[PDB]
Amino acid sequence: AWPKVQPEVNIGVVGHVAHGKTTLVQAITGIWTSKHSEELKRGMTIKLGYAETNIGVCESCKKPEAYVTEPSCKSCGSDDEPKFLRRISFIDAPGHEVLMATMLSGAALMDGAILVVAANEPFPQPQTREHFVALGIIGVKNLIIVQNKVDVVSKEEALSQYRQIKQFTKGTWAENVPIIPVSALHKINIDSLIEGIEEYIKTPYRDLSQKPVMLVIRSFDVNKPGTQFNELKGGVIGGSIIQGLFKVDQEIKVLPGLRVEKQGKVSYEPIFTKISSIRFGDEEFKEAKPGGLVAIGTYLDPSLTKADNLLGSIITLADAEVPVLWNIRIKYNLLERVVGAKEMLKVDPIRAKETLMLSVGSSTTLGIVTSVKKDEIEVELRRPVAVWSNNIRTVISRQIAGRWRMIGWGLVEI
Numbered sequence: 001a002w003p004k005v006q007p008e009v010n011i012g013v014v015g016h017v018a019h020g021k022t023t024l025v026q027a028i029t030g031i032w033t034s035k036h037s038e039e040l041k042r043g044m045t046i047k048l049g050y051a052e053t054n055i056g057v058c059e060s061c062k063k064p065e066a067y068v069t070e071p072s073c074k075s076c077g078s079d080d081e082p083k084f085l086r087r088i089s090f091i092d093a094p095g096h097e098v099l100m101a102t103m104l105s106g107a108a109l110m111d112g113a114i115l116v117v118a119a120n121e122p123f124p125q126p127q128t129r130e131h132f133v134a135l136g137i138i139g140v141k142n143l144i145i146v147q148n149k150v151d152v153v154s155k156e157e158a159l160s161q162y163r164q165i166k167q168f169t170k171g172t173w174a175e176n177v178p179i180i181p182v183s184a185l186h187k188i189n190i191d192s193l194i195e196g197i198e199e200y201i202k203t204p205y206r207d208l209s210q211k212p213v214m215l216v217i218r219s220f221d222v223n224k225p226g227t228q229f230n231e232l233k234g235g236v237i238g239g240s241i242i243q244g245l246f247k248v249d250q251e252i253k254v255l256p257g258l259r260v261e262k263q264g265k266v267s268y269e270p271i272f273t274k275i276s277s278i279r280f281g282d283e284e285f286k287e288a289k290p291g292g293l294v295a296i297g298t299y300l301d302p303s304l305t306k307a308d309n310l311l312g313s314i315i316t317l318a319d320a321e322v323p324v325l326w327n328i329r330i331k332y333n334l335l336e337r338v339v340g341a342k343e344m345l346k347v348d349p350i351r352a353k354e355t356l357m358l359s360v361g362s363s364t365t366l367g368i369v370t371s372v373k374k375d376e377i378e379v380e381l382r383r384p385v386a387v388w389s390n391n392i393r394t395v396i397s398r399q400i401a402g403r404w405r406m407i408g409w410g411l412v413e414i
Ligand SMILES: Nc1nc2c(ncn2[C@@H]2O[C@H](COP(=O)(O)OP(=O)(O)OP(=O)(O)O)[C@@H](O)[C@H]2O)c(=O)[nH]1
Pocket: 015, 016, 017, 018, 019, 020, 021, 022, 023, 024, 043, 044, 045, 046, 093, 094, 095, 096, 148, 149, 150, 151, 152, 182, 183, 184, 185, 186
């Protein structure tokens, strides 16, 4: 048998709308990540999708078919049990141009990524470009490019596109990244991709002694109809542990916390609670480390967590000191052009009084520019952000032609 362990690595899946991200994750894991009504009706990803799988290798078989996602080697002709390698998970991003902020919140959780490129569409499409640039900015450099939908193009067309992809990465940080051709729909060459994931998206080093920090991307009321009462539960908070570890019965706090009134003004009150349970997928654990998206059970009133109310928050230990800032100073750089537009325009300099969109960790916040200097801006935010370390990456977006567009990035200076 294989052990039951949490995923140890997060692999982002990014790329232009409908190029096959969610179908690729299904091909690898058997899971369709879309769970929301509007996602199922529109046939598109809207919220961040998630799925897990074990990975193993049949030591008596040849690669790539030796790589498997279940404890069997029957498919490559061996009665031996495959050797367990690791459990992995996928952060399945929306590709739609209006949902770039959601992709960015997911990229803060990624240990590596797969950029999916449809073989039957012109290259490079706007969000092929935009997600590629975003990965570079955020520093997700452990990248595999997957050429999907090769089932509906000729060998000649696929090779032509392959050469344009290599030329696109030429002279960039991604110059050496592998391109793996597959069909997600018909599950062709998926074993080569799994081998690729093992070779190019290794589990990163973690620091388990750093102050525990979880970036929140989901929060739920897990109580369903037709249940007794001795099986009802407090609110659940879901996200990615980016450093340290958490344990059942630990006293924790949610930051910035709850929007409340205090002394005639709007305030954020840190939410203190205790960890009641820890789950990854369908399995319970006594502790949680980086890797995977964890569900943290709490003793909170489920009305506090219902419907992703805490999205963008962080969780730390109760006694941790974490800055919560209404005003932030950013050492910034601007992109040369608006890469996500169908027509790439030049990026205008930042001006005082502009309303910008800031991506910080899993949070997305609007703010007004109160100060512009050559490489430093100061922003008055509409909501405070939790800033758990010095020099956290932020991505800057501006509304251009009715759309939020990524235009730059920087470090939040504390
Ligand atoms: N022929 C062919 N069609 C595919 C393949 N992979 C995905 N598709 C089809 O492409 C369409 C979009 O697939 P999705 O997996 O939903 O693409 P997506 O990238 O997740 O789309 P968004 O999340 O909305 O940005 C669906 O109709 C799929 O069945 C493939 O390998 N070959």
